[PDB]
Protein backbone atom coordinates (compact mmCIF):
# COMPACT_ATOMS: atom_id res chain seq x y z
CA UNK A 1 0.00 0.00 0.00
CA UNK A 2 2.57 2.50 1.28
CA UNK A 3 5.20 0.00 0.16
CA UNK A 4 3.89 0.22 -3.42
CA UNK A 5 5.64 3.53 -4.00
CA UNK A 6 8.90 2.26 -2.48
CA UNK A 7 8.83 -1.04 -4.42
CA UNK A 8 8.88 0.87 -7.73
CA UNK A 9 12.54 1.68 -7.06
CA UNK A 10 13.89 -0.73 -4.38
CA UNK A 11 13.91 -4.48 -3.73
CA UNK A 12 13.49 -4.85 0.06
CA UNK A 13 15.53 -7.35 2.05
CA UNK A 14 15.81 -8.13 5.80
CA UNK A 15 15.16 -5.67 8.65
CA UNK A 16 18.63 -4.70 9.92
CA UNK A 17 17.57 -2.62 12.91
CA UNK A 18 14.62 -1.44 14.94
CA UNK A 19 14.68 1.58 17.20
CA UNK A 20 12.12 3.59 19.10
CA UNK A 21 11.13 5.70 16.12
CA UNK A 22 12.02 3.70 13.00
CA UNK A 23 12.83 0.34 11.51
CA UNK A 24 15.44 -0.04 8.87
CA UNK A 25 15.61 -2.54 6.06
CA UNK A 26 18.43 -3.48 3.77
CA UNK A 27 17.33 -2.84 0.18
CA UNK A 28 18.72 -2.72 -3.35
CA UNK A 29 18.24 0.30 -5.56
CA UNK A 30 16.94 -1.24 -8.76
CA UNK A 31 18.47 1.19 -11.29
CA UNK A 32 22.04 1.11 -9.93
CA UNK A 33 22.29 -2.22 -8.11
CA UNK A 34 23.45 -0.31 -5.00
CA UNK A 35 22.57 -1.57 -1.55
CA UNK A 36 20.94 1.07 0.65
CA UNK A 37 19.35 1.29 4.09
CA UNK A 38 15.72 2.33 4.22
CA UNK A 39 14.48 3.99 7.39
CA UNK A 40 10.76 3.45 7.76
CA UNK A 41 8.60 5.66 9.95
CA UNK A 42 4.86 5.41 10.49
CA UNK A 43 3.34 8.91 10.70
CA UNK A 44 0.37 7.63 12.77
CA UNK A 45 2.31 5.83 15.54
CA UNK A 46 4.95 8.60 15.79
CA UNK A 47 2.44 11.42 16.34
CA UNK A 48 4.18 13.96 18.60
CA UNK A 49 7.66 12.68 17.59
CA UNK A 50 6.98 13.45 13.87
CA UNK A 51 9.17 16.60 14.31
CA UNK A 52 12.19 14.24 14.77
CA UNK A 53 11.73 13.13 11.15
CA UNK A 54 11.71 16.61 9.61
CA UNK A 55 14.64 17.61 11.83
CA UNK A 56 16.76 14.70 10.61
CA UNK A 57 15.67 15.27 7.04
CA UNK A 58 16.52 18.96 7.01
CA UNK A 59 19.85 18.36 8.77
CA UNK A 60 20.87 15.64 6.29
CA UNK A 61 20.01 17.82 3.29
CA UNK A 62 22.63 20.25 4.70
CA UNK A 63 25.32 17.75 5.66
CA UNK A 64 27.63 16.18 3.14
CA UNK A 65 30.77 14.64 4.65
CA UNK A 66 33.00 11.56 4.47
CA UNK A 67 31.99 10.51 8.03
CA UNK A 68 28.27 11.28 7.81
CA UNK A 69 25.72 8.79 6.48
CA UNK A 70 24.37 10.16 3.21
CA UNK A 71 20.68 10.73 2.48
CA UNK A 72 19.49 9.70 -0.99
CA UNK A 73 15.70 9.71 -1.24
CA UNK A 74 12.76 10.83 0.86
CA UNK A 75 9.40 9.25 0.00
CA UNK A 76 6.21 10.15 1.83
CA UNK A 77 3.08 8.06 1.43
CA UNK A 78 -0.32 8.30 3.11
CA UNK A 79 0.96 6.62 6.31
CA UNK A 80 4.76 6.26 6.01
CA UNK A 81 7.90 8.29 5.59
CA UNK A 82 10.76 6.47 3.91
CA UNK A 83 14.31 7.77 4.14
CA UNK A 84 16.80 5.97 1.90
CA UNK A 85 20.27 6.18 3.36
CA UNK A 86 23.75 4.91 2.81
CA UNK A 87 24.06 1.28 3.93
CA UNK A 88 26.99 0.61 6.29
CA UNK A 89 27.71 -3.13 6.03
CA UNK A 90 30.08 -3.20 9.04
CA UNK A 91 27.27 -2.45 11.49
CA UNK A 92 27.68 -0.61 14.78
CA UNK A 93 30.80 0.60 16.50
CA UNK A 94 29.18 -0.61 19.74
CA UNK A 95 29.12 -4.25 18.56
CA UNK A 96 32.65 -3.88 17.25
CA UNK A 97 33.87 -2.74 20.72
CA UNK A 98 32.11 -5.65 22.48
CA UNK A 99 33.68 -8.17 20.05
CA UNK A 100 37.21 -6.78 20.74
CA UNK A 101 36.54 -6.14 24.45
CA UNK A 102 38.25 -2.73 24.10
CA UNK A 103 40.46 -1.03 21.60
CA UNK A 104 44.13 -0.23 21.99
CA UNK A 105 44.88 3.46 22.28
CA UNK A 106 46.32 3.36 18.71
CA UNK A 107 43.15 1.95 17.18
CA UNK A 108 40.92 4.10 19.42
CA UNK A 109 42.74 7.14 18.01
CA UNK A 110 42.09 5.94 14.40
CA UNK A 111 38.40 5.59 15.17
CA UNK A 112 38.06 8.60 17.42
CA UNK A 113 39.58 11.05 14.93
CA UNK A 114 36.80 10.06 12.50
CA UNK A 115 34.16 10.75 15.18
CA UNK A 116 35.77 14.16 15.93
CA UNK A 117 35.94 14.90 12.18
CA UNK A 118 32.18 14.19 11.76
CA UNK A 119 31.05 16.04 14.88
CA UNK A 120 33.30 19.13 14.33
CA UNK A 121 31.87 19.36 10.78
CA UNK A 122 28.31 19.08 12.14
CA UNK A 123 29.15 21.99 14.50
CA UNK A 124 30.80 23.96 11.67
CA UNK A 125 27.44 23.84 9.83
CA UNK A 126 25.63 25.25 12.88
CA UNK A 127 24.25 22.01 14.42
CA UNK A 128 24.72 19.94 17.56
CA UNK A 129 24.06 16.17 17.16
CA UNK A 130 22.98 15.66 20.82
CA UNK A 131 22.72 11.84 20.61
CA UNK A 132 26.29 10.72 20.11
CA UNK A 133 26.90 7.13 21.19
CA UNK A 134 28.49 4.08 19.58
CA UNK A 135 25.14 2.71 18.37
CA UNK A 136 24.98 5.83 16.12
CA UNK A 137 28.35 5.27 14.50
CA UNK A 138 28.51 2.63 11.76
CA UNK A 139 31.30 1.02 9.74
CA UNK A 140 31.06 1.42 5.94
CA UNK A 141 32.61 -1.02 3.39
CA UNK A 142 36.02 0.67 3.91
CA UNK A 143 35.74 0.12 7.73
CA UNK A 144 35.46 3.95 8.05
CA UNK A 145 32.92 5.44 10.44
CA UNK A 146 29.64 7.03 9.49
CA UNK A 147 27.53 9.04 11.87
CA UNK A 148 23.74 8.46 11.84
CA UNK A 149 20.48 9.58 13.49
CA UNK A 150 20.06 13.33 13.28
CA UNK A 151 16.52 13.27 14.79
CA UNK A 152 17.62 15.20 17.91
CA UNK A 153 20.06 17.56 16.21
CA UNK A 154 19.69 21.25 17.16
CA UNK A 155 20.30 24.44 15.14
CA UNK A 156 21.10 8.09 25.66
CA UNK A 157 21.27 9.08 29.38
CA UNK A 158 24.67 7.42 29.81
CA UNK A 159 26.00 9.73 27.07
CA UNK A 160 24.17 12.95 28.04
CA UNK A 161 26.10 15.87 29.52
CA UNK A 162 25.18 17.13 33.08
CA UNK A 163 24.09 20.55 31.77
CA UNK A 164 21.83 19.02 29.10
CA UNK A 165 20.18 16.63 31.54
CA UNK A 166 19.77 19.65 33.88
CA UNK A 167 18.07 21.70 31.07
CA UNK A 168 20.92 24.27 30.70
CA UNK A 169 24.94 24.45 25.27
CA UNK A 170 24.82 21.94 22.41
CA UNK A 171 28.44 22.26 21.32
CA UNK A 172 29.92 21.55 24.77
CA UNK A 173 27.38 18.75 25.31
CA UNK A 174 28.61 16.92 22.20
CA UNK A 175 32.16 17.13 23.58
CA UNK A 176 31.00 15.48 26.83
CA UNK A 177 29.32 12.71 24.81
CA UNK A 178 32.54 12.21 22.77
CA UNK A 179 34.40 11.83 26.10
CA UNK A 180 32.03 9.01 27.10
CA UNK A 181 32.63 7.51 23.66
CA UNK A 182 36.37 7.81 24.07
CA UNK A 183 36.07 6.08 27.49
CA UNK A 184 34.00 3.18 26.07
CA UNK A 185 36.42 2.70 23.13
CA UNK A 186 39.42 2.36 25.49
CA UNK A 187 37.72 0.67 28.48
CA UNK A 188 34.88 -1.37 26.99
CA UNK A 189 32.31 -0.21 29.55
CA UNK A 190 30.63 3.07 30.50
CA UNK A 191 32.24 5.51 32.88
CA UNK A 192 28.81 6.18 34.44
CA UNK A 193 26.34 3.32 34.70
CA UNK A 194 23.56 2.10 36.91
CA UNK A 195 20.33 0.13 36.66
CA UNK A 196 18.50 2.98 38.45
CA UNK A 197 18.16 6.09 36.27
CA UNK A 198 18.36 8.62 39.13
CA UNK A 199 21.45 6.91 40.55
CA UNK A 200 22.97 7.15 37.04
CA UNK A 201 21.99 10.80 36.99
CA UNK A 202 23.81 11.30 40.35
CA UNK A 203 26.98 9.60 39.08
CA UNK A 204 26.99 11.85 36.03
CA UNK A 205 26.57 15.00 38.14
CA UNK A 206 29.39 13.92 40.46
CA UNK A 207 31.72 13.23 37.49
CA UNK A 208 33.75 10.50 39.24
CA UNK A 209 34.67 7.42 37.28
CA UNK A 210 36.92 4.42 37.41
CA UNK A 211 40.32 4.86 35.68
CA UNK A 212 41.50 1.44 34.43
CA UNK A 213 45.13 0.34 34.74
CA UNK A 214 45.72 0.03 30.97
CA UNK A 215 45.09 3.79 30.25
CA UNK A 216 48.11 6.01 29.44
CA UNK A 217 48.58 9.26 31.41
CA UNK A 218 47.86 11.30 28.29
CA UNK A 219 44.57 9.44 27.67
CA UNK A 220 43.56 9.97 31.31
CA UNK A 221 44.25 13.65 30.91
CA UNK A 222 42.19 13.87 27.73
CA UNK A 223 39.22 12.13 29.46
CA UNK A 224 39.49 14.50 32.38
CA UNK A 225 39.37 17.48 30.02
CA UNK A 226 36.36 16.12 28.05
CA UNK A 227 34.44 14.82 31.12
CA UNK A 228 34.38 18.03 33.11
CA UNK A 229 30.94 18.40 34.66
CA UNK A 230 31.17 22.19 34.21
CA UNK A 231 30.95 22.93 30.45
CA UNK A 232 33.03 26.10 30.99
CA UNK A 233 35.96 24.00 32.23
CA UNK A 234 35.46 21.35 29.50
CA UNK A 235 37.85 21.28 26.51
CA UNK A 236 36.35 23.14 23.53
CA UNK A 237 35.94 21.48 20.16
CA UNK A 238 38.73 23.76 18.89
CA UNK A 239 41.42 22.36 21.21
CA UNK A 240 40.23 18.79 20.78
CA UNK A 241 41.20 18.98 17.10
CA UNK A 242 44.93 19.32 17.82
CA UNK A 243 45.15 17.87 21.35
CA UNK A 244 48.52 16.12 21.97
CA UNK A 245 46.90 12.71 22.56
CA UNK A 246 44.91 13.19 19.32
CA UNK A 247 48.13 14.20 17.46
CA UNK A 248 50.18 11.16 18.57
CA UNK A 249 51.32 9.23 15.41
CA UNK A 250 49.51 11.73 13.12
CA UNK A 251 51.18 15.10 13.84
CA UNK A 252 48.39 17.05 12.16
CA UNK A 253 45.05 18.22 13.59
CA UNK A 254 41.84 16.26 12.88
CA UNK A 255 40.69 16.77 9.28
CA UNK A 256 37.05 17.88 9.78
CA UNK A 257 36.25 19.77 6.56
CA UNK A 258 34.16 17.90 4.04
CA UNK A 259 36.33 16.19 1.46
CA UNK A 260 33.33 15.44 -0.81
CA UNK A 261 31.24 18.67 -0.94
CA UNK A 262 28.63 19.38 -3.66
CA UNK A 263 30.28 21.92 -5.97
CA UNK A 264 29.12 21.37 -9.60
CA UNK A 265 27.07 18.43 -10.91
CA UNK A 266 29.20 15.50 -12.08
CA UNK A 267 29.23 15.11 -15.89
CA UNK A 268 29.49 11.33 -16.00
CA UNK A 269 26.45 10.98 -13.74
CA UNK A 270 24.40 13.51 -15.72
CA UNK A 271 25.49 11.93 -19.00
CA UNK A 272 24.64 8.43 -17.91
CA UNK A 273 21.23 9.57 -16.68
CA UNK A 274 20.51 11.41 -19.97
CA UNK A 275 21.61 8.43 -22.06
CA UNK A 276 19.76 5.82 -19.96
CA UNK A 277 16.52 7.88 -19.83
CA UNK A 278 16.94 9.18 -23.44
CA UNK A 279 16.43 12.75 -22.30
CA UNK A 280 17.82 16.09 -23.27
CA UNK A 281 21.02 16.71 -21.28
CA UNK A 282 20.16 20.27 -20.24
CA UNK A 283 16.71 19.21 -18.97
CA UNK A 284 18.40 16.38 -17.05
CA UNK A 285 20.78 18.92 -15.45
CA UNK A 286 17.89 21.23 -14.62
CA UNK A 287 15.82 18.45 -13.02
CA UNK A 288 18.77 17.09 -10.95
CA UNK A 289 19.45 20.69 -9.85
CA UNK A 290 16.04 20.90 -8.17
CA UNK A 291 17.58 18.59 -5.50
CA UNK A 292 14.17 17.24 -4.57
CA UNK A 293 15.49 14.03 -2.89
CA UNK A 294 13.11 12.11 -5.15
CA UNK A 295 14.20 9.09 -7.22
CA UNK A 296 16.20 11.21 -9.66
CA UNK A 297 18.27 12.63 -6.76
CA UNK A 298 18.64 9.07 -5.42
CA UNK A 299 19.91 7.78 -8.78
CA UNK A 300 22.29 10.68 -9.28
CA UNK A 301 23.82 10.33 -5.77
CA UNK A 302 24.11 6.57 -5.99
CA UNK A 303 25.96 7.03 -9.33
CA UNK A 304 28.33 9.53 -7.60
CA UNK A 305 28.87 6.83 -4.93
CA UNK A 306 29.98 4.34 -7.60
CA UNK A 307 32.47 6.97 -8.75
CA UNK A 308 33.61 7.69 -5.17
CA UNK A 309 34.79 4.07 -4.91
CA UNK A 310 36.44 3.97 -8.38
CA UNK A 311 33.66 2.07 -10.18
CA UNK A 312 32.24 3.13 -13.55
CA UNK A 313 29.07 5.23 -13.57
CA UNK A 314 26.56 2.71 -15.11
CA UNK A 315 22.73 2.32 -14.74
CA UNK A 316 20.92 -1.01 -15.29
C1 LIG B 1 22.68 -6.78 10.21
N1 LIG B 1 23.15 -6.54 11.60
C2 LIG B 1 23.63 -5.35 12.08
O1 LIG B 1 23.94 -5.25 13.27
C3 LIG B 1 23.70 -4.21 11.24
C4 LIG B 1 23.15 -3.00 11.65
C5 LIG B 1 23.21 -1.85 10.83
C6 LIG B 1 23.84 -1.91 9.56
N2 LIG B 1 23.96 -0.90 8.64
C7 LIG B 1 23.20 0.21 8.64
N3 LIG B 1 23.46 1.12 7.69
C8 LIG B 1 22.75 2.32 7.65
C9 LIG B 1 21.75 2.62 8.56
C10 LIG B 1 21.05 3.89 8.49
F1 LIG B 1 21.52 4.65 7.47
F2 LIG B 1 19.78 3.75 8.36
F3 LIG B 1 21.21 4.60 9.68
C11 LIG B 1 21.52 1.62 9.54
N4 LIG B 1 20.58 1.84 10.47
C12 LIG B 1 20.11 0.85 11.46
C13 LIG B 1 20.45 1.28 12.76
N5 LIG B 1 21.72 1.08 13.11
C14 LIG B 1 22.21 1.44 14.38
C15 LIG B 1 21.36 2.03 15.29
N6 LIG B 1 20.02 2.26 14.90
C16 LIG B 1 19.57 1.88 13.68
N7 LIG B 1 18.29 2.12 13.32
C17 LIG B 1 17.28 1.71 14.32
S1 LIG B 1 18.15 3.79 12.87
C18 LIG B 1 18.52 4.89 14.23
O2 LIG B 1 16.75 4.15 12.42
O3 LIG B 1 19.13 4.01 11.73
N8 LIG B 1 22.25 0.48 9.54
C19 LIG B 1 24.40 -3.13 9.19
C20 LIG B 1 24.35 -4.25 10.00
CL1 LIG C 1 42.04 13.12 10.67
NA1 LIG D 1 33.74 -2.16 35.37
NA1 LIG E 1 40.27 20.11 7.70
List the helices and strands and how they pair.
Elements lengths: L2 H5 L2 E9 L4 E7 L4 E9 H4 L3 H12 L9 E6 L3 E7 L4 E2 H8 L4 H20 L12 E3 L5 E3 L14 H4 L4 H18 L9 H10 L10 H10 L10 H4 L3 H4 L19 H11 L3 H8 L6 H14 L8
Antiparallel strand pairs: 1-2, 2-3, 3-5, 4-5, 6-7, 7-8
Helix pairs in contact: 5-7, 7-9, 12-13
Bound molecules: ligand 7KD, chloride ion and sodium ion (NA) (2 copies).
User: What is the alpha-carbon Rg in Å?
Assistant: 21 Å
Largest sheet: 5 strands, antiparallel
Per CATH, the class reads Mainly Alpha
Strand order of the largest sheet: 1-2-3-5-4
Structural class: alpha+beta
Q: Order of SSEs, N→C?
A: HEEEHHEEEHHEEHHHHHHHHH
Question: What bound compounds does this protein have?
Answer: ligand 7KD, chloride ion, sodium ion
Domain Protein kinase: 10-246
Subunit structure: Monomer. Interacts with ZNF622 and PPP1R8.
Modified residues (Phosphoserine): 156, 236
Protein name: Maternal embryonic leucine zipper kinase
Amino acid sequence: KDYDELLKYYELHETIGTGGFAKVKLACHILTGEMVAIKIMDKNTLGSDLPRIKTEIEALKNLRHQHICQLYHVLETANKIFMVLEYCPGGELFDYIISQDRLSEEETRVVFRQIVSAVAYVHSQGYAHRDLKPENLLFDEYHKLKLIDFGLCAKSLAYAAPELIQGKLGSEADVWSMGILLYVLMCGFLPFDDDNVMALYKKIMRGKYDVPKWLSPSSILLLQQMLQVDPKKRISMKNLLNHPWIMQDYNYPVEWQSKNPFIHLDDDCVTELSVHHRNNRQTMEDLISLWQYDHLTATYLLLLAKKARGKPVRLR
